[PDB]
Amino acid sequence: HHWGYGKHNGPEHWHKDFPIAKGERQSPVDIDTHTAKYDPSLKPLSVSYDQATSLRILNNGHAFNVEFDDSQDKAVLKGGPLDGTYRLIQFHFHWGSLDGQGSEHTVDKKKYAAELHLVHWNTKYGDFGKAVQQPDGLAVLGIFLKVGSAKPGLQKVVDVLDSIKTKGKSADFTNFDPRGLLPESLDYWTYPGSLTTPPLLECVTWIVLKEPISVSSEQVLKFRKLNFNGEGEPEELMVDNWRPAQPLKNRQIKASFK
C-alpha cells in the first residue's frame, strides 16, 4: 500500500486500493455555514484533558502523531453529539505548502493553513481497532489553524520536529498538555464521516470547531521542513498532506450555536 499525496499516489488514486473512498460518508467536507442548522438538542461539549499523558511523537510518513497513554480514562471527550465516553489516543495536523491551503475541511470553500485532529475512540468498543469497525467508533475534534500570532502551547511540538524529520523516526514526548492547542470557544459543527486517509473507514463523528487558532509563520514553516521520505532517501518535503473536500451526499451538518 503506497498511498500518499503526490501526483502519482495522491487522493484521486486512493479508490483503487480503498473503494470506500467513493462511499456515502466520506471526509472531509465543505461546511456551508448558511445550510448548517442550529440543533438545540446538542448537549454541551465536554473536553476533559486535565489528566492527559502524552508519550511519544512519531513521523509516520503521512503526518506526525503525538501519541497518548489511553490504557485508562485520562483524557476524554464527551457531550455534544456523542453518546458515552471517547478516549484521546493521538493528535496530528494536516498542512499546506503555502498559507493559502492545508486544511481538510473548508468553511464556505475557505481553506485554512492547517487543521489539527484530536483523535478519540469510543470506550464501549474496548480498543481502537475494534472501534474503527463501528459507525460510532471514533470522534475527531478538528481545529483550524490560521497564520498570525504564535501559539505558545504549540512551540514544544515545533521544537521537537528537527528530531523526527523522516519517516519512521520517533522521539519521547511526555508531559505535553493538549489544552494549549484549543481556541477560547468550543462552538462547533458536527456531521457523520470518515477517516481522511486510508483506510478511509466510515467510523467518525466529526466535531469541527468554528474558532481557528492562530499560529506564527515561523511555526508552520517548521512543519513544512518535515519529510515524507525515510532517512537517506530523496528528500520530499512533507507538505500538502490534506485530502480535498468530498461529496456531502445524504448528510446534514449541525451547528452547536445560533
Ligand X SMILES: NS(=O)(=O)c1ccc2oc(NC(=O)c3ccccc3)nc2c1
Enumerate the active-site residues.
Answer: 62
Q: CB under 5 to 8 A by kind: which of ligand X, Zn ion, none does 207 bind?
A: none
- Write the binding mask 152 to 191 for Zn ion: x where contact by CB under 5 A, - elsewhere: ----------------------------------------
By CB atoms closer than 10 A (0-12, 13-18, 19+), residue 10 is middle
Nearer to Zn ion, 92 or 210 (CB): 92
With contact defined as beta carbons under 8 Å apart, do 213 and 144 qualify?
yes
DSSP one-letter code for 230: P
Shortest distance in whole angstroms from residue 38 CB to ligand X: 26
**Which residue numbers belong to the known binding site for Zn(2+)?**
92, 94, 117
Residues 101-140 interacting with Zn ion (rule: CB under 5 A): 117
With contact defined as beta carbons under 8 Å apart, do 240 and 101 qualify?
yes
Alpha-carbon separation of residue 49 from 73, 154, 175 (angstroms): 10, 16, 12
d(CA 52, CA 73): 9
Q: CB under 5 to 8 A by kind: which of Zn ion, ligand X, none does 90 bind?
A: ligand X
Nearer to Zn ion, 151 or 243 (CB): 243
Shortest distance in whole angstroms from residue 17 CB to ligand X: 15
Shortest distance in whole angstroms from residue 175 CB to ligand X: 20
Peptide bond preceding 178 in cis form (omega within 30 of 0):
no
| Residues at the contact surface with Zn ion, assessed by CB under 5 A | 117
